[PDB]
Amino acid sequence: MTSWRDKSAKVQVKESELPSSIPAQTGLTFNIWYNKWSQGFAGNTRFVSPFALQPQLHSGKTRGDNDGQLFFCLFFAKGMCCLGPKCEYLHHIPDEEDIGKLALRTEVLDCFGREKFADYREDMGGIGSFRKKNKTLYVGGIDGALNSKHLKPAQIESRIRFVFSRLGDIDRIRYVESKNCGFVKFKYQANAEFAKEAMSNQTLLLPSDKEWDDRREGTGLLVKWANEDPDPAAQKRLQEELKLESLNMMVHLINNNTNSA
Amino acid sequence: DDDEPPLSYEQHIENIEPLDPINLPLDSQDDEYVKDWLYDSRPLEEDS
Amino acid sequence: LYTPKAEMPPEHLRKIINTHSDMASKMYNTDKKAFLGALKYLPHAILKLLENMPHPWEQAKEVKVLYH
Amino acid sequence: MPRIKTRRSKPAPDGFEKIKPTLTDFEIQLRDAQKDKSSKLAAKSNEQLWEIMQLHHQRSRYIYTLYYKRKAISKDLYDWLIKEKYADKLLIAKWRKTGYEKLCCLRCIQKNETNNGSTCICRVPRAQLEEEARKKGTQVSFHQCVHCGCRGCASTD
Amino acid sequence: YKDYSRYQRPRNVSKVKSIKEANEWKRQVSKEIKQKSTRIYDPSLNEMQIAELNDELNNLFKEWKRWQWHI
Amino acid sequence: FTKSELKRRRKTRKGDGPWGSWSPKKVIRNYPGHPEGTTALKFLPKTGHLILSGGNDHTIKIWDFECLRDFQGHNKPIKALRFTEDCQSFLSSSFDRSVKIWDTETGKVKTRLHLNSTPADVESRPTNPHEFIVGLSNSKILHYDDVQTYDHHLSSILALKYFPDGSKFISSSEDKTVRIWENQINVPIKQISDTASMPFLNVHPNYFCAQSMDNRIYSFSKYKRHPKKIHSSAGYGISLAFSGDGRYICSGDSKSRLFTWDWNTSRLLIPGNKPITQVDWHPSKVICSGAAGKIYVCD
Amino acid sequence: NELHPTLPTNHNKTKLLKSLKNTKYFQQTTIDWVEAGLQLCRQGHNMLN
Ligand SMILES: [Zn+2]
Ligand SMILES: [Zn+2]
Ligand SMILES: [Zn+2]
Ligand SMILES: [Zn+2]
């Protein structure tokens, strides 16, 4: 309301300021059908995203708000949308009012409107599956994000807790030092889909660090979909919440038979 | 040259005047009926 | 019903062929398919071009075209 | 007949030079619009098409107002403009009809091209479109026509 | 470009250049470390051969120390 | 709705209708006005409100970023001009063997620096130290107290720069070398001999420099160039400009060396007269002095 | 050519360009012949590429 509904959305990147459509050259000749580079080897292909979402800054009314659009702007999340207030999709953190609109729709496709698939991708990356309502992200690749600063093991979690708290309500955040990776679980799936594209290829630097001028030189972190939590301290919480979900559905379902009779 | 692309019409051709065409001298007395319209692109196109 | 196919400015066509000079964006993916799908029709366009070639007496010849 | 000043082209009539400075100014705007402004968005590319349909509309609307609303050009000039492609023969003719005087495009009226046999939206009056916005409880979900971007050619608007 | 899959070690470690460059020469050791480690445990029975191959391992592993030492 | 009410509604759209709403580099400007050719250009470092342009007519004409004022007082061609950041001072240097200071406040010569042997083709103002760095056909760099002379290469010194950290002075000469100077020790810290005459250099606003030659523009802590026989300027946007003597303006990226554009200037109302002598960016615009007696603004 | 006549068929009611014009995807305009040739060369190279 005061932070979001009061203002209008702002142009994040100028349309001249947008990156070039060709990728960085990792081959000898450019391929025109498949917009990639062909001959020779294939190098790396991952780079730090130059752009990042400042959520309390860039949120505002847009064109999709008056139209009743259901879906969020993909390049609002990357910090890359050049249309600003003239864009057909939404430019704000998903809320309970917003996911209530997506409730019939979230089952088969994400908050960005892209269709979910049958099974997960091999590296658990990408959009996701409709078969599992996954609400947990695997925050990985943290060394290339931090530009190989050491720091400690719990300060890394402090960077994770500050950044992902702006991207929605959180169920829990777990960091594992031995695996150098984090597990962030959200209240809703739509926040998790939103924060996944928001934090792909980003860096946890906070310009109070000395490498802030060299934030671009790194690799960038991987936010991917999480697998199941293998400890039985969490497994028993899964079937406990699945039980409560089933009891909340049966009360709703006997009222269908009450009206059916 | 095969190296250079085919040049754009609106920049390099549209502005220039064309050139004279291959029109015969044409008589004024013998060819009076036809000299008005013999070399039109579509001859007598609007003559009802 | 029916009408007489609309007449379009020349600048509308010329913008299109200027825009598809270097096509590397993601928006061009359907249009990339369209060029391959038009390849079967291309000897027909060559016939309609070489039969409409200007004869020696005329400087320029304005033909009527149908474009995607 | 061709836009090129061929030898075949009949020379200009008398009142032409009084309106040649505006007509050249429309011409140089058209040359700028076709320059391959390379963009990445599909929303930006068709806006570049929308500017071209706007400029060509504005030129023919000016020639229409000179001959019909002001009668400040001769008929020999006005036929010379149409034969030398400066104005659209058909788009002017639709403007003469009582419904279509502020018409967007020849493309917009055509029933055939669309999915259902309808004109495009930018042919509907806004006050009617405001009415379904009152009905649905939702502000009007139209901004620009796809094949030009018009915002109401509607005669009432 | 320029692959790093073509050239040699190159022989001296100290003569190599900026850190983003020696990183890829370093993994250009580790793959042959990985490849010939898998070639250790094989039951292929040539005991003379795997002895000279064991010395090549110790050579490359010492190089791997040296590339880490330069960094 | 009524026809009068519907009339007052139809004006509420912004344009007249029907589009009325409900709810690389290019050449922007050409400036003539110098009588002779224009050798050097510098811009006001604080406000960006003016230019200081030298000439071959010995004058200096302050152009609005219109012509504000003329600064005479040199007897010969003004090869270099530099404006100071922390001072309201302008250091001009010419072919008359003198480095002349200028008080921008009152517009009069304050100081004249002496003991150069021959024409002085470069002035660079050291940022922190209140120093002047001049270099010339004298084959030496003279550090002026606004003190030190540096045993130079072996030939005339074309371009000189200053930086606050070590290697304070970067110098370039027609012996095809580029030296990095340790001024307190007053001897060479490092020599860069990879150039095959280096006529121009430019400091990136990354702590590096872009070095020029006839056919190869290098960088120093390459750039892909064909035959562009020989000024350089580095925008804060990475883009690295290159002025040619064959009229070609070679625009490049200082990250992939890639050359994304090459332009060609229209000479004037001779074909040999169309080079670009000097060039500079503001503190999104490019200001290039040419030997056709004109200043061109590239947007 | 005159010994073996091939007679045309009368049920060919769909020409190429007539049926092809009917679709929403094509539009119609008039331009110079040389411009038509240069567009076809630019398109035709772009297809084979
Ligand atoms: Zn957007
Ligand atoms: Zn229209
Ligand atoms: Zn329309
Ligand atoms: Zn319209």
UniProtKB/Swiss-Prot annotation, chain A:
Is-annotated flag, keyword Zinc-finger?
A: yes
Q: Does the keyword Transcription apply?
A: no
- Which cell locations does it reside in? Nucleus
Give the UniProt keywords, A-Z. Cell cycle, Metal-binding, mRNA processing, mRNA splicing, Nucleus, Phosphoprotein, RNA-binding, Spliceosome, Zinc, Zinc-finger
List cystine links.
none
Q: Which GO terms describe its cellular component?
A: Prp19 complex; U2-type catalytic step 1 spliceosome; U2-type catalytic step 2 spliceosome
Instruction: Determine the domain of life of the protein's source.
Output: Eukaryota
Record-level Gene Ontology MF annotations? pre-mRNA binding; U6 snRNA binding; zinc ion binding
Task: Give start-end positions of each zinc finger (C3H1-type).
Answer: 67-94
Q: What else is known?
A: Present with 2650 molecules/cell in log phase SD medium.
Q: What does the record give as the function of this protein?
A: Involved in the first step of pre-mRNA splicing. Required for cell growth and cell cycle control. Plays a role in the levels of the U1, U4, U5 and U6 snRNAs and the maintenance of the U4/U6 snRNA complex. May provide the link between the 'nineteen complex' NTC spliceosome protein complex and the spliceosome through the U6 snRNA. Associates predominantly with U6 snRNAs in assembled active spliceosomes. Binds directly to the internal stem-loop (ISL) domain of the U6 snRNA and to the pre-mRNA intron near the 5' splice site during the activation and catalytic phases of the spliceosome cycle.
- UniProt note: domains: The C-terminal RRM domain and the zinc finger motif are necessary for RNA-binding.
- Name the UniProt record assigns to this protein: Pre-mRNA-splicing factor CWC2
Source organism per UniProt: Saccharomyces cerevisiae (strain ATCC 204508 / S288c)
**Full-length numbering of the shown residues:** 1 to 261 of 339
UniProtKB/Swiss-Prot annotation, chain D:
What does the UniProt entry say about where the protein is found?
A: Nucleus
Q: Name one GO biological process term.
A: mRNA splicing, via spliceosome
Q: Does the keyword RNA-binding apply?
A: no
Chief localisation class = nucleus
Which GO CC annotations does the UniProt entry carry?
Answer: nucleus; Prp19 complex; spliceosomal complex; U2 snRNP
Q: Which UniProt keywords apply?
A: mRNA processing, mRNA splicing, Nucleus
Where would I look for the motif Nuclear localization signal in this sequence? 2-11
This molecule's function is given as:
Involved in pre-mRNA splicing. Important for bud site selection.
Q: How does it assemble?
A: Belongs to the CWC complex (or CEF1-associated complex), a spliceosome sub-complex reminiscent of a late-stage spliceosome composed of the U2, U5 and U6 snRNAs and at least BUD13, BUD31, BRR2, CDC40, CEF1, CLF1, CUS1, CWC2, CWC15, CWC21, CWC22, CWC23, CWC24, CWC25, CWC27, ECM2, HSH155, IST3, ISY1, LEA1, MSL1, NTC20, PRP8, PRP9, PRP11, PRP19, PRP21, PRP22, PRP45, PRP46, SLU7, SMB1, SMD1, SMD2, SMD3, SMX2, SMX3, SNT309, SNU114, SPP2, SYF1, SYF2, RSE1 and YJU2.
Other known facts: Present with 1900 molecules/cell in log phase SD medium.
Query: What's the family?
Result: Belongs to the BUD31 (G10) family.
| Name by which UniProt lists this protein | Pre-mRNA-splicing factor BUD31
The UniProt gene name for this protein comes to: BUD31
Swiss-Prot record, chain E:
Additional facts recorded: Present with 1990 molecules/cell in log phase SD medium.
- First-to-last residue of the parent protein present: 26 to 96 of 235
Which organism was this protein described from?
Saccharomyces cerevisiae (strain ATCC 204508 / S288c) (Baker's yeast)
Compartments, record wording? Cytoplasm; Nucleus
- The organism's place on the tree of life at top rank: Eukaryota
Q: What subunit structure does UniProt give?
A: Belongs to the NTC complex (or PRP19-associated complex), composed of at least CEF1, CLF1, ISY1, NTC20, SNT309, SYF1, SYF2, and PRP19.
> What family does the Swiss-Prot or TrEMBL record give for this protein?
Belongs to the ISY1 family.
Query: Would you tell me the protein name for this molecule?
Result: Pre-mRNA-splicing factor ISY1
Q: What does this protein do?
A: Involved in pre-mRNA splicing and cell cycle control. As a component of the NTC complex (or PRP19-associated complex), associates to the spliceosome to mediate conformational rearrangement or to stabilize the structure of the spliceosome after U4 snRNA dissociation, which leads to spliceosome maturation. The cell cycle arrest of SYF2 defective cells may be due to the inefficient splicing of TUB1. Also involved in DNA repair.
Curated annotation (Swiss-Prot), chain F:
* Assembly and interaction partners: Belongs to the CWC complex (or CEF1-associated complex), a spliceosome sub-complex reminiscent of a late-stage spliceosome composed of the U2, U5 and U6 snRNAs and at least BUD13, BUD31, BRR2, CDC40, CEF1, CLF1, CUS1, CWC2, CWC15, CWC21, CWC22, CWC23, CWC24, CWC25, CWC27, ECM2, HSH155, IST3, ISY1, LEA1, MSL1, NTC20, PRP8, PRP9, PRP11, PRP19, PRP21, PRP22, PRP45, PRP46, SLU7, SMB1, SMD1, SMD2, SMD3, SMX2, SMX3, SNT309, SNU114, SPP2, SYF1, SYF2, RSE1 and YJU2.
Q: Where is the signal peptide?
A: none
Task: Quote the function comment for this protein.
Answer: May function in the second step of pre-mRNA splicing. Regulatory protein involved in replication and mitotic spindle formation and/or maintenance. Required for initiation and completion of S-phase and for initiation and completion of DNA replication. Might be required for the maintenance of microtubules. Essential only at elevated temperatures.
Q: Tell me what this protein is called.
A: Pre-mRNA-processing factor 17
One term of GO molecular function: mRNA binding
Record field: compositional bias (Basic residues): 1-13
A GO term from the CC aspect:
spliceosomal complex
Q: Identify the coding gene.
A: CDC40
Q: Which organism is it from?
A: Saccharomyces cerevisiae (strain ATCC 204508 / S288c)
Top-level taxon: Eukaryota
Report the record's Gene Ontology biological process terms: generation of catalytic spliceosome for second transesterification step; mRNA 3'-splice site recognition; mRNA branch site recognition; mRNA splicing, via spliceosome
Compartments where located = Nucleus
Return the WD repeat spans: 33-69, 73-112, 152-191, 195-227, 231-269, 271-298
